[PDB]
Design a protein around this motif. Sequence first.
Motif, PDB file in Angstrom:
ATOM      1  N   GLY A  16      86.891  -5.419  66.178  1.00 54.10           N
ATOM      2  CA  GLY A  16      86.048  -4.483  65.475  1.00 54.10           C
ATOM      3  C   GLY A  16      85.559  -4.955  64.125  1.00 54.10           C
ATOM      4  O   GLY A  16      84.681  -4.309  63.549  1.00 54.10           O
ATOM      5  N   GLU A  22      86.717  -7.406  54.921  1.00 54.15           N
ATOM      6  CA  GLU A  22      87.864  -6.774  55.540  1.00 54.15           C
ATOM      7  C   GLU A  22      89.040  -7.718  55.657  1.00 54.15           C
ATOM      8  O   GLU A  22      90.130  -7.285  56.022  1.00 54.15           O
ATOM      9  N   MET A  34      89.291  -2.140  47.474  1.00 52.22           N
ATOM     10  CA  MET A  34      90.674  -2.265  47.896  1.00 52.22           C
ATOM     11  C   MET A  34      90.806  -3.582  48.639  1.00 52.22           C
ATOM     12  O   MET A  34      89.810  -4.102  49.154  1.00 52.22           O
ATOM     13  N   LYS A  37      92.661  -6.339  55.074  1.00 51.82           N
ATOM     14  CA  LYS A  37      93.654  -5.908  56.062  1.00 51.82           C
ATOM     15  C   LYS A  37      94.995  -6.601  55.891  1.00 51.82           C
ATOM     16  O   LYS A  37      96.043  -6.028  56.206  1.00 51.82           O
TER      17      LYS A  37
ATOM     18  N   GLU B  20      86.329   6.081  56.254  1.00 48.78           N
ATOM     19  CA  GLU B  20      87.674   6.562  56.534  1.00 48.78           C
ATOM     20  C   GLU B  20      88.225   7.425  55.410  1.00 48.78           C
ATOM     21  O   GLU B  20      89.443   7.605  55.312  1.00 48.78           O
ATOM     22  N   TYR B  30      89.985   9.705  41.199  1.00 51.69           N
ATOM     23  CA  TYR B  30      88.658   9.349  41.678  1.00 51.69           C
ATOM     24  C   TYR B  30      87.697  10.518  41.447  1.00 51.69           C
ATOM     25  O   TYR B  30      88.106  11.667  41.252  1.00 51.69           O
ATOM     26  N   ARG B  65      83.465   1.434  55.300  1.00 54.95           N
ATOM     27  CA  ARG B  65      84.808   1.086  54.878  1.00 54.95           C
ATOM     28  C   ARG B  65      85.470   0.313  56.012  1.00 54.95           C
ATOM     29  O   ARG B  65      84.800  -0.198  56.917  1.00 54.95           O
ATOM     30  N   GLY B  66      86.794   0.193  55.952  1.00 52.11           N
ATOM     31  CA  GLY B  66      87.553  -0.139  57.140  1.00 52.11           C
ATOM     32  C   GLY B  66      87.347   0.927  58.199  1.00 52.11           C
ATOM     33  O   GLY B  66      87.213   2.109  57.868  1.00 52.11           O
ATOM     34  N   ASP B  67      87.285   0.530  59.462  1.00 50.47           N
ATOM     35  CA  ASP B  67      86.985   1.491  60.514  1.00 50.47           C
ATOM     36  C   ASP B  67      88.191   2.391  60.746  1.00 50.47           C
ATOM     37  O   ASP B  67      89.328   1.903  60.759  1.00 50.47           O
TER      38      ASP B  67
END
Lengths: 73, 73
Positions: A16, A22, A34, A37, B20, B30, B65-67
């Motif tokens: 994905g 990421e 951020m 992973k 997410e 935030y 974002r991250g999924d």
Amino acid sequence: IARSMNRKFHRISLGGVRDEAEIRGHRRTYIGAMPGKLIHAMKQVGVINPVILLDEIDKMSSDWRGDPASAML
Amino acid sequence: IARSMNRKFHRISLGGVRDEAEIRGHRRTYIGAMPGKLIHAMKQVGVINPVILLDEIDKMSSDWRGDPASAML
């Protein structure tokens, strides 16, 4: 293998993924920044030597959206 | 199924955003302080039991974002 070696397991699912950010993170200057992973994975386990499963590495894509394999190198 | 077992019912209807941040929110520091769309579902119900239908999971809130796969996991 993780249970047999008395270590800690955490799998990251590739396939994905579509961009470099990421795997590495973003610089702190941006909002909603951020790390990637992999530092999340090293945070979830508590130790310095876990086992980590990177499944479907042949399913990463290289197109106009990004190129995560070069950051995986 | 819900009325057969005396639970309650909701619909949470995923895919409408592309991040997410609706599942796990952002901290009080935030600017946009949106809490959990599960946690607001646990607000709309008063019970810890209820069944929760999840519409449109094939199209998800991905790709900025991250999924939110592991968020669903």
